[PDB]
Amino acid sequence: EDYNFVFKVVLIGESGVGKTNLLSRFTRNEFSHDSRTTIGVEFSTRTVMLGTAAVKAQIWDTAGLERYRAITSAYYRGAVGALLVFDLTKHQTYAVVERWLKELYDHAEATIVVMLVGNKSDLSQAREVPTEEARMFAENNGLLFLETSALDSTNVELAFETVLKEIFAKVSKQ
Ligand SMILES: Nc1nc2c(ncn2[C@@H]2O[C@H](COP(=O)(O)OP(=O)(O)O)[C@@H](O)[C@H]2O)c(=O)[nH]1
Ligand SMILES: [Mg+2]
């Protein structure tokens, strides 16, 4: 229980993109295919060293994020980070990224650090979203960017640590 900050980081994007498995990989180094999940919303935690600061990352996840729900407001409330995940082998999951941003900014504060994540990079042979295209989008929209694989661990820790360093930088100036 050595930590100085608690950072709430929510995972968002279409179902099937890998959000639950980015959580499990980062927090438990685990990867399932059909994940046992509780009803509604959950989080898992991981303490991370940022230089000499101890930060407790609170990673939030759910299966039904969906604007009609009463719970959406509470889900986003107090979030200082977000990973907006798409499946790089499914163009459709990336085509709705703008819509997810809008949903996110209706409920999160503008200071939230957002990373656009292209997941399933181990399947880059079957890619439908050029890295360059996704990268420019993120730059035009004030989003950090990375491609990850929750399956092969590529960039998962880096994804989370980059968001967390950006949050810490930011909140130090608040
Ligand atoms: N090849 C590959 N499959 C993945 C990856 N991440 C998740 N999956 C699979 O995609 C499916 C959905 O992933 P899940 O974590 O439940 O996504 P969620 O619906 O966004 O929470 C499951 O079969 C996962 O095992 C990845 O990085 N690579
Ligand atoms: Mg899930």
From Swiss-Prot:
Record GO terms (molecular function): G protein activity; GTP binding; GTPase activity; myosin V binding
Subunit and partners: Interacts (GTP-bound form) with RAB11FIP1, RAB11FIP2, RAB11FIP3 and RAB11FIP4. Interacts (via the hypervariable C-terminal region) with ITGB1 (via the cytoplasmic region); the interaction is GTP-dependent. Interacts with ITGAV. Associates with the integrin alpha-V/beta-1 heterodimer. Interacts with VPS33B.
Cofactor (UniProt): Mg(2+)
Residues of the whole record sequence present: 7 to 180 of 213
Sorted UniProt keywords: Cell membrane, Cell projection, Cytoplasmic vesicle, GTP-binding, Hydrolase, Lipoprotein, Membrane, Methylation, Nucleotide-binding, Prenylation, Protein transport, Transport
Domains: entry comment: Switch 1, switch 2 and the interswitch regions are characteristic of Rab GTPases and mediate the interactions with Rab downstream effectors. The switch regions undergo conformational changes upon nucleotide binding which drive interaction with specific sets of effector proteins, with most effectors only binding to GTP-bound Rab.
Any single Gene Ontology cellular-component annotation: recycling endosome
Catalytic activity: GTP + H2O = GDP + phosphate + H(+)
UniProt protein name: Ras-related protein Rab-25
Compartment annotation: Cell membrane; Cytoplasmic vesicle; Cell projection, Pseudopodium membrane
Motif Switch 2 positions after renumbering to this chain: 61-78
Activity control, per UniProt: Regulated by guanine nucleotide exchange factors (GEFs) which promote the exchange of bound GDP for free GTP. Regulated by GTPase activating proteins (GAPs) which increase the GTP hydrolysis activity. Inhibited by GDP dissociation inhibitors (GDIs) which prevent Rab-GDP dissociation.
Function: The small GTPases Rab are key regulators of intracellular membrane trafficking, from the formation of transport vesicles to their fusion with membranes. Rabs cycle between an inactive GDP-bound form and an active GTP-bound form that is able to recruit to membranes different set of downstream effectors directly responsible for vesicle formation, movement, tethering and fusion. RAB25 regulates epithelial cell differentiation, proliferation and survival, thereby playing key roles in tumorigenesis.
Protein source organism: Homo sapiens (Human)
Membrane topology reported for the UniProt record: Lipid-anchor
